[PDB]
RNA sequence: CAUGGUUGUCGUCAGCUCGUGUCGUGAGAUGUUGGGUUAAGUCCCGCAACGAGCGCAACCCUUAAGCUUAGUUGCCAUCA
């Protein structure tokens, strides 16, 4: 669980935004404010970095899945790696509009990634012309562009770890409607009434993301 | 102007929607808009939509170069 401040504030984590762009409900987590920036109150992280953690560890261990979502350039990588390295899912490109709520339809396009990779592992690109084949090989990269790291999810993920719950808000609307409790990294500048286990931290420094998202895949590795 | 069948027309114009999801108190919207391009809702990219049907194109004829199979009634190079 627990993290040590010194790596926390060496990681970036305590920064924030301009004093103009700020949300009055993250006023409990601020600390001071230097040079137009707000500055976060790590000691409220460090109680909440873990309080997220040993919710993660509990949930991996009863069979849960845990969708990682993050898409802002900082996140797309450090979520694809660490979501892998514990065996969960993730989504890096467009959050396709409507995959949890409209799931029944977006599945069928997650099982047409597999009607196709069974046509080329057998023969059959010979029987079909070049004007019916040049198609089936970039309808394989659209459907893999977006749905790639999710193609082994059959039911709604139990929890969900979101990285920017303002760029991401398309998703949170969907989870908060299916009741899928969210864990997420709020910057300043964002709003915690929609989320369940907020992590008051930074949001732009790549290392700030990966460090924190380092953990939450540790703590599904271990309670497991 | 009680019908069924057949037929012009706008017009070969690029349209006309549906499931499921979301938005809206509702009628409705979205998708179908947007940056581009195309004869073409034709294609890419983006995007609360994700896909699908009828159209569009192509599969059909007849035209413009050849190549094997064939030589009457067609053709007449090399000969009377």
Describe the protein.
The protein has helices at residues 5-10, 42-60, 73-84, 103-108, 113-116, 142-147, 169-178, 206-221, and strands at 30-32, 39-40, 66-69, 89-91, 159-162, 182-186, 197-200. Helix 3 runs parallel beside helix 8 (206-221). The protein has a 5-stranded parallel β-sheet with strand order 4-3-5-6-7, with helices on both faces. It has a two-stranded antiparallel ribbon with strand order 1-2. It starts with a helix and ends with a helix. 35% of the residues lie in helices and 11% in strands. A hairpin with a 6-residue loop joins strand 1 and strand 2. By secondary structure, the chain is α/β, with parallel strands linked by helices. The chain binds one RNA strand of 80 nucleotides through helix 4 and helix 7.
Relevant terms:
alpha/beta; RNA-binding; 1 chains; part of a larger assembly; 35% helix; two-stranded antiparallel ribbon; 224 residues; elongated; 7 strands
What is this structure, in a nutshell?
The chain has 224 residues and is of the alpha/beta class. It is built from 8 helices and 7 strands. This is Small ribosomal subunit protein uS2.
List the helices and strands and how they pair.
Elements: H1 5-10, E1 30-32, E2 39-40, H2 42-60, E3 66-69, H3 73-84, E4 89-91, H4 103-108, H5 113-116, H6 142-147, E5 159-162, H7 169-178, E6 182-186, E7 197-200, H8 206-221
Parallel strand pairs: 3-4, 3-5, 5-6, 6-7
Antiparallel strand pairs: 1-2
Helix pairs in contact: 2-8, 3-8
This protein binds one RNA strand of 80 nucleotides through helix 4 and helix 7.
GO biological process, one term: translation
Pfam families: Ribosomal_S2 (PF00318)
Protein name: Small ribosomal subunit protein uS2
